[PDB]
Design a protein around this ligand. Sequence first.
Ligand SMILES: N=C(N)NCCn1cc(-c2c[nH]c3nc[nH]c(=O)c23)nn1
Length: 230
Amino acid sequence: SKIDYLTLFPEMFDGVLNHSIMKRAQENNKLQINTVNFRDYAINKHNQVDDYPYGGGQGMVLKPEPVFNAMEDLDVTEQTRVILMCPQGEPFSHQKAVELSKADHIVFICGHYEGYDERIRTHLVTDEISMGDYVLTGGELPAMTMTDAIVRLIPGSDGLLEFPQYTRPREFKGLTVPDVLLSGNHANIDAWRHEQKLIRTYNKRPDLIEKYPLTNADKQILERYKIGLK
Ligand SMILES: N=C(N)NCCn1cc(-c2c[nH]c3nc[nH]c(=O)c23)nn1
């Protein structure tokens, strides 16, 4: 499997591909990653990859020819998935990460451009994906985050919040690890962790409690808690 990124700043990805999961999986002969710069396929008078929009508008638009050429050199096939980092795209999701981990070749089109030529979108892009309602400067960090979640799904819940976890030391600033965790009584350790899960969910995410098949023990735990409050 292989991932290629079209970027103006191929060096933003320095140290994110040479370390962690990217370093591991790429070393392991699992994924080939290539960075590709624009303006390496530009032919404009200033070697530009953006020009002004027909009809007017404030911004500048990425031109189609450098991008189709970039797809050409990257040996994009009819089954390659070309992902446009688009602020109005479908929000990225675990479902989509599972879907994309099934893909032999992937290309991210990254860029700060206010606009993209519609030719690119109609005949080149297979996928347009957002990071969320917030506004970013470019598609490079989105591209890398999505790559993280996808690569992690390469061969290389219960409905509640997590239970608190503690490690050494037992005491720190007078803040004491709960004693049940050191008693070596695993039935109590698990019962306590479950109680904390119910209580933390009740306090911070009551919607999750509503969608949870509460037992009679769970109801009693929450009721003893909310009475212990008063
Ligand atoms: N087309 C416009 N407005 N570009 C402006 C500059 N920009 C933004 C993005 C972008 C990519 N992915 C995102 N996910 C969530 N919000 C975002 O803003 C983005 N890429 N370039």
